Write a protein that binds this DNA or RNA. Structure first.
Lengths: 128, 214, 81, 179
RNA sequence: GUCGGGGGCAUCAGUAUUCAAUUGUCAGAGGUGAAAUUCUUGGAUUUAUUGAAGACUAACUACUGCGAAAGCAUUUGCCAAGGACGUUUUCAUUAAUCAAGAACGAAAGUUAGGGGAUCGAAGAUGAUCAGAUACCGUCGUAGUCUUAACCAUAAACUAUGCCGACUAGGGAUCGGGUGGUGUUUUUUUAAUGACCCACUCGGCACCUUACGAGAAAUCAAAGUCUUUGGGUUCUGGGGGGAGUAUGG
């Protein structure tokens, strides 16, 4: 068909971002290895350099089939931390726009929870 | 590991016959060796997409469908209805500073040896004559709204089949027992019914539909 | 307050202001001498009743007790004082 | 055929939205040929495009953030920079993640971020070249990736504790070489 | 009649949490300011499905509501009391505090058990360069959660013992009581509910000119005290030495 929909994640985070492009199911992970292939550095990856170019690891791997339209999908961590579309998590929305992979969904899969377990740290600070 | 080349064909997905758009797009199937792995991947899979696709309405209806695929018929896949939820886009855009949420749940062995868990949430209302900042029910009436909604999700699943539940949602005849048989307490607005979790089929039958073919 | 005795104020200003705070004490509620629809016998229930009146002819519960004042069953003829 | 994004509006941001309409579409609908619909009862911020409303690849990416970033507390002035850089991003906090904060400890560790008459907030408005909004716990940053690294390390100790003058006295060890 | 995130006994749901498996997989992630600590071609981590445990009910969450205090926020059933309010019901002074005496008691800690999910004082590791400063990171016995019991410590603070008297001045609150030839969906103009204008007592608050104070920040009580006395209980006498020695 002309509109053969896929589903593309984003995985908004720091220190890297992950790209998980298979279609509609949890099988075979077609345009997926790990979206951190594209630096020569230690951690310089939440900058759009292992992030905006990680969608160009799959810009050629999506067109192993040739699919035009996917479902974009912001994802947070899943847990208890700070959870939003962040600086590594616009970039997988950035480069999928400019690579011809069309715009789908907004489902930030994370708990905005009704519980909160014993978090990472003590009374003197968790994060920065 | 096994046969790393010919894991490639395209099988589509047929919508359950109560909706409009059957042919909703091809997917890459990797199984030519053995049609139980091409059955296990096609007898229980939640394939969630929008209700904008199925019924036809410009909202991704907020209501996207857990849609458990059932059976194979040859290059086309037999399906029924499994469940539904609210996406956080409309669920979170409502909560003002001064209202009160009302929560409910009903689980009951329903009519096919199926156990349906329906979540339905309600919201208080600044009435058109309301000059309060707020709307808090006189918290027995926070209970009394929650205890008289308790009959509506009971009868409207005790009387229905698996087909009629989604068909009582497009003008929401369910609401026309919500807003006509719990309105007798406090004003409510922007009220909905949330989730259709059929998690417990405590009986899984054998399975040969032949009537929801499409 | 400037020059008036408090036998000589504006009178009804403090009259609804919570009975005992008034210049002397005078109770809030009232008496009623009313007759049921079952006997036409004058059955004096108190305005702020606490007792569910069984009829003197029937067994009908001709009032329902509520705080503040009670809630009668309709059919009671009223008149003044 | 039709091609759509869709977003709603949180209802504490409804009230800064319907009075902020008159000059958000003339910076959008005379350059970006589209149409959007505001209303009063369903809160639908509906923006969709077409092949006839040119479907070039990098055109559905940064044009939404003229109002999608207005809704998170920012103004209409800062968020045009999405269409200037490929390293201009956002940052959203959640204040109950820095520590286990409760009570007036979430008011004695908010007031020491804006400062006395905004004079710590204005001081961060000359350090990281950002905009930062205090809703209650929403704090949002339009920086540029190394600015928000030093904006995440700008509220390193504004909450958990060091004096605010020592944000430029003690933390000048971090606020110089501003690796 | 209300009221009720009040307290207690069972049931019970949540986003999911991490842990466990199936299942999908095919060469990177991890932090901190630079960095240093680990898993996997005998399958990584971003996928799809079912359980144990605990947490708290996130947003609605305040000009909040309550409870002796410590305290308490999602349902349903169960148990008394309380608080308010109404009453032309009953005792007719049964009363206030408080030497002695007795309950309760956060966090932490103390014995004997249950789980052992979450992080994690100590600790075992990697740090890592002189003390840009040592903030980092990772696992973590106990502990956090409970059961039969202690302990009797807080900035247990509104830094103000408890019963009295009056005054300001307010628009709201919440718990009760009322209905304007009082305005609309509709019980039928003011019904379920909720309203403008008024009125009452309960709890939580605010800010004005400060009459009164205070040395002063400020306080409608930290007042009515040199114009010194409504009632009652426990403390303080310069700094230390010192809440130390000694004894009970």
């Amino acid at each position: 068909n002309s509109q053969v929909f896929g589903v593309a994640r984003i995985y908004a985070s720091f220190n890297d971002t992950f790209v998980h492009v298979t279609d509609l199911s949890g099988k075979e992970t077609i345009a997926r290895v790990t979206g951190g292939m594209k630096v020569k550095a230690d951690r310089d990856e939440s900058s759009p350099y292992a992030a905006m170019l990680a969608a160009q690891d799959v810009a050629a791997k999506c067109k192993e089939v040739g699919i035009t339209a996917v479902h974009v999908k912001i994802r947070a961590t899943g847990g208890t931390r700070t959870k939003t579309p962040g600086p590594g998590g616009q970039a997988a929305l950035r480069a999928l726009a400019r690579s011809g992979l069309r715009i789908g969904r907004i489902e930030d899969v994370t708990p905005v929870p009704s519980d909160s377990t014993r978090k990472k740290g003590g009374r003197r600070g968790r994060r920065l | 590991v096994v046969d790393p080349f010919t894991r490639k064909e395209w099988f589509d997905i047929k919508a359950p016959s109560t909706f409009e758009n059957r042919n909703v797009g091809k997917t890459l199937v990797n199984k030519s060796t053995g049609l139980k792995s091409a059955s296990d991947a096609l007898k229980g899979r939640v394939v969630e997409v929008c209700l904008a696709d199925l019924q036809g309405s410009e909202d991704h209806s907020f209501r996207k469908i857990k849609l458990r695929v059932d059976e194979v018929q040859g290059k086309n896949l037999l399906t029924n209805f499994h469940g539904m939820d609210f996406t956080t886009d409309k669920l979170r855009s409502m909560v003002r500073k001064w209202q009160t949420l009302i929560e409910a749940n009903v689980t009951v062995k329903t009519s096919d040896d199926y156990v349906l868990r329906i979540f339905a949430i309600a919201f208080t209302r600044k009435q058109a004559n309301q000059v309060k900042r707020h709307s808090y029910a006189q918290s027995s009436h926070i209970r009394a709204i929650r205890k008289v909604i308790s009959e509506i999700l009971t009868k409207e699943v005790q009387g229905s089949t698996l087909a009629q539940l989604t068909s009582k949602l497009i003008p929401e005849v369910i609401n026309k027992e919500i807003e006509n048989a719990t309105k007798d307490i406090f004003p409510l607005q922007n009220i909905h019914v949330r989730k259709v979790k059929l998690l417990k089929q405590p009986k899984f039958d054998v399975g040969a539909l032949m009537a929801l073919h499409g | 307050v400037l020059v008036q005795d408090l036998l000589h104020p504006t009178a009804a200003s403090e009259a609804r202001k919570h009975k005992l705070k008034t210049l002397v004490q005078g109770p809030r509620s009232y008496f009623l001498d009313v007759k049921c629809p079952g006997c036409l016998n004058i059955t004096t229930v108190f305005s702020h009743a606490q007792t569910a009146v069984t009829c003197e002819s029937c067994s009908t519960i001709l009032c329902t007790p509520t705080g503040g004042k009670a809630k009668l069953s309709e059919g009671t003829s009223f008149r003044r004082k | 055929k039709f091609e759509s994004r869709k977003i709603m509006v949180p209802p504490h941001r409804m009230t800064p939205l319907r009075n902020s309409w008159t000059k958000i579409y003339p910076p959008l609908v005379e350059h970006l040929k589209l149409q959007v619909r505001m209303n009063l009862k369903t809160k639908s911020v509906e923006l969709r495009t077409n092949p006839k409303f040119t479907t070039d690849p990098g055109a559905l990416q940064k044009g939404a953030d003229f109002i999608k970033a207005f809704t998170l507390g920012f103004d209409l002035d800062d968020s045009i920079a999405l269409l200037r850089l490929d390293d201009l991003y956002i940052e959203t906090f959640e204040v109950k993640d820095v520590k286990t904060l409760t009570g007036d400890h979430l008011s004695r560790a908010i007031g020491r971020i804006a400062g006395k008459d905004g004079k710590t907030k204005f001081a961060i408005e000359n350090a990281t070249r950002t905009r930062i909004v205090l809703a209650d716990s929403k704090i949002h940053i339009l920086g540029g990736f190394t600015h928000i690294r030093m904006a995440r390390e700008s509220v390193v100790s504004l909450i958990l504790g060091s004096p605010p003058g020592k944000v430029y006295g003690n933390l000048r060890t971090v606020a110089s070489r501003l690796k």
